[PDB]
Structure 1
Amino acid sequence: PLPPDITFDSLALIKMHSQNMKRILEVTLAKFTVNLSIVTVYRYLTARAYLKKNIEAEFEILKDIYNIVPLLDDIAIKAAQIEANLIKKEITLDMEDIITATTAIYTNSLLVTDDPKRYEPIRRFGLDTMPLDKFIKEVELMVEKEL
């Protein structure tokens, strides 16, 4: 089964909100505690701003649904520690990946993403990931089993 605390990166959050995922989204929000990094929220909004959506309004909706986690001092410190040792090993990941993974570790959330291997170098620091497609199938199974 799946753990209670989970999170998504911007790409995954975009899909979770697509019209084809309406049902899966409803179940996920009803059964899980989703902790999103403000960074993930900002990047999601960039995609929404691209198609001229009302950002201010969509932000309130997200805030009214999710536990939006700020870039806390502890996250800033932890992220700097992870990035520095990774960099010391010629491993370079973009800022979004670092903050997203650091926040997942901090909130003890399973990071659902369509590209888990990209985050693989952060596992050693405590990060746990799961393929989005497997996550979706898991939730569907949950629905099938219900009374």
Structure 2
Amino acid sequence: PLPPDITFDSLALIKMHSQNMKRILEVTLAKFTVNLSIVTVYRYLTARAYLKKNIEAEFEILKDIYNIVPLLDDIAIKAAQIEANLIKKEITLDMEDIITATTAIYTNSLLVTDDPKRYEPIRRFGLDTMPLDKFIKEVELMVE
């Protein structure tokens, strides 16, 4: 029941690359198109650079296995419109969340996340989400 195009936020991506999720990641990469915002990639890389002196090799691997979507002009434009609208409704969200969410709408990617409630105000603009625990379970259910 999962659509072909998905994405992750930074915390979800960090969990997806943890050693205990190897098998879910392999299946995910074998069966979905994964479109990561450069901003998500940036934040994941800050978590990686906390441990390692070299993160460049890491980035090259991500660029191969994922579609890394830049902060395109259309995304900058659409993010500005969404963020303006939310602020008027007394809701002001972090840059990372707006760009992640707007990039997901732009690529028609389902946003797999540990905290889907944080993006609930953006669903009005076409964003679809799924909890990571539920994504994982659905990947586990892909079993013969």
- Partner SS, residue 34 of structure 1: strand
- Judging changes above 3 Å, is the alpha-carbon distance between structure 1 residues 47 and 61 closer, same or farther for their aligned structure 2 residues? same
- Judging changes above 3 Å, is the alpha-carbon distance between structure 1 residues 4 and 53 closer, same or farther for their aligned structure 2 residues? farther
Tell me what 2:58 maps to.
Answer: 58
Give me the whole-angstrom Cα distance separating, in 2, the residues matched to 1:24 and 1:89.
Answer: 38
**1:51: how far off?**
1.0
**1:89: how far off?**
1.2
Give me the whole-angstrom Cα distance separating, in 2, the residues matched to 1:124 and 1:66.
Answer: 27
Q: What is the CA deviation profile of residues 1-51 of structure 1, one whole-angstrom value per residue up to 9, with x for unaligned ones?
A: 100000000000000000000001000000000000000000000000011
Give me the whole-angstrom Cα distance separating, in 2, the residues matched to 1:97 and 1:120.
Answer: 11
Give me the whole-angstrom Cα distance separating, in 2, the residues matched to 1:13 and 1:53.
Answer: 20
Can you give the 5+ residue segments of structure 1 that lack an aligned partner in the other structure? none
Q: What is the CA deviation profile of residues 72-129 of structure 1, one whole-angstrom value per residue up to 9, with x for unaligned ones?
A: 0000000000000101111011000000000000000000000000000000000000
TM-score (norm 2): 0.98
Tell me what 1:26 maps to.
Answer: 26
Give me the whole-angstrom Cα distance separating, in 1, the residues matched to 2:8 and 2:119.
Answer: 12
**1:52: how far off?**
1.8
- Judging changes above 3 Å, is the alpha-carbon distance between structure 1 residues 92 and 68 closer, same or farther for their aligned structure 2 residues? same
Matches within 5 A, 1:44-83: 44-52=44-52, 54-83=54-83
Can you give the 5+ residue segments of structure 2 that lack an aligned partner in the other structure? none
Q: What count of residue pairs does the alignment treat as equivalent?
A: 143
**1:54: how far off?**
2.0
**1:53: how far off?**
5.0
Compute the RMSD of aligned alpha carbons: 0.6
Q: What is the CA deviation profile of residues 118-146 of structure 1, one whole-angstrom value per residue up to 9, with x for unaligned ones?
A: 00000000000000000000000012xxx
Query: Once superposed, which parts of structure 1, at least 4 consecutive aligned residues long, lie more than 6 Å away?
Result: none
TM-score (norm 1): 0.96
